[PDB]
Symmetry: C2
């Protein structure tokens, strides 16, 4: 563990103290005859690193709804806000992901910062449900089924399998 | 930040959650539609690493006097006990460092785990004070003083400088 220089008030000696680990701060510095003392950051404050500071940093304002915490205000961390799942940030705040219509699917999964990206189902695939998440699904393999295609599929439906 | 697998109670789905940073634990696991939630370890408990556990570890018993804390019980750390300064651990507990008598000095500085190690002042050095800390000091250089040695030194005293 690291260390820091401190000027001792009574003696004006420059001491070398041990740092305090993250999530704590130095509640009394070392002197010529005792070690420094660490205390945990009180609720509402944080330190990210091993430090020698005398007060913990203050946690940012609470997350504006509809936003939510992906990290909390804790000893070692500032709170960190994100759009909840199924939403994504645009400008001001959060908007819900695109819902890919029947006949399309997700090409690029949506994130907390990018919307979802849809593409029309390519031939041989189809998608039968609106969803901001599902990929186009391959048709059922009628061949490797010991069967044949009774009805062809479409971008919206599987092909239907059987015989005669 | 890392992640862990969790089996969702209602659905028996195996989810992938984000881990919680050190000093927090997971107060509610992620589900198919919400992110996991971290809480800071309550006073008296700790987590050393980014984890996915549901309760923080318990902090060890307080330090037996004469011993003192070199790290505290905090979110990210277990308390860690040491002999106070000027003492060192032997067997049971703590004993004070050897005090090097006049005419000796410290060869090896004492630690919280090793005693101090003394050697008789070598010729040209001396030490005039009992101390569990000070090294043998070189005599004053009478030559580079524009002066001469009126009295020789000893292992206990400097030489005394002047003229005639």
């Amino acid at each position: 563990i690291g260390t820091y220089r401190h000027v001792d008030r009574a003696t004006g000696q420059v001491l070398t103290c041990d740092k305090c680990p993250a999530g704590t701060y130095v509640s009394e510095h070392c002197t010529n005859t005792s070690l420094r003392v660490c205390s945990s950051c009180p609720v509402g404050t944080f330190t990210r690193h091993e430090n020698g500071i005398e007060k913990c940093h203050d946690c940012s304002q609470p997350c504006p709804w509809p936003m939510i915490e992906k990290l909390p205000c804790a000893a070692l961390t500032d709170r960190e806000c994100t759009c909840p799942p199924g939403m994504f940030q645009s400008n001001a705040t959060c908007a819900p992901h695109t819902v890919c219509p029947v006949g399309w699917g997700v090409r690029k999964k949506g994130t907390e910062t990018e919307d979802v990206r849809c593409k029309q189902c390519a031939r041989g695939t189809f998608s039968d449900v609106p969803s901001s998440v599902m990929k186009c699904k391959a048709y059922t393999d009628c061949l490797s089924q010991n069967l044949v295609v009774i009805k062809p599929g479409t971008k919206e439906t599987d092909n239907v399998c059987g015989t005669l």
